[PDB]
Design a protein around this ligand. Structure first.
Ligand SMILES: *C/C=C(C)/C=C/C=C(C)/C=C/C1=C(C)CCCC1(C)C
Length: 137
């Protein structure tokens, strides 16, 4: 279906708690929470090939992958990882990540298109799940 589009954030829950697990100190967590409320996501989907651009006020990152094929990106706190995306259903995908170097919490993300037209992103570190909700621009 239609993950493709320009998405703007309307809600962000538990992001600070996620960063805390990931070792980010309090002042930076607060500033990162503020940056997250300006998050925008651009998606182009062709079959199971995805191009995804996630940006805030001063930063932009591009993610390109094909479902089922390993690729490299970074974790939320910015560490290089190897990632692999699989479908969980018609309109939900789940990404498992593995650190390229060292150790750290187990991280992952999911993206889901709901029947109400929302895009739901979850990001996980161990026990803690951040949920962000987007709507089309
Ligand atoms: C498929 C969508 C993905 C994997 C989204 C990834 C988003 C991030 C890695 C966002 C990170 C951010 C920070 C680390 C602080 C600034 C605000 C965010 C949400 C852009």
């Amino acid at each position: 279906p239609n993950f493709s589009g320009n998405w703007k954030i309307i809600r962000s829950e538990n992001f600070e708690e996620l960063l805390k697990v990931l070792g980010v100190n309090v002042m930076l967590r607060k500033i990162a929470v503020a940056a997250a409320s300006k998050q925008a996501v651009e998606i182009k989907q062709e079959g199971d090939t995805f191009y995804i651009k996630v940006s805030t006020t001063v930063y932009t990152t591009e993610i390109n992958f094909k479902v089922g094929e390993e690729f490299e990106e970074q974790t939320v706190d910015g560490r290089p990882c190897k990632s692999l995306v699989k479908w969980e259903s018609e309109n939900k995908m789940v990404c498992e990540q593995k650190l390229l170097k060292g150790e750290g919490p187990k991280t992952s993300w999911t993206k889901e298109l709901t029947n109400d037209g929302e895009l739901i992103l979850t990001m996980t570190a161990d026990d803690v799940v951040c949920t962000q909700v987007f709507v089309r621009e």
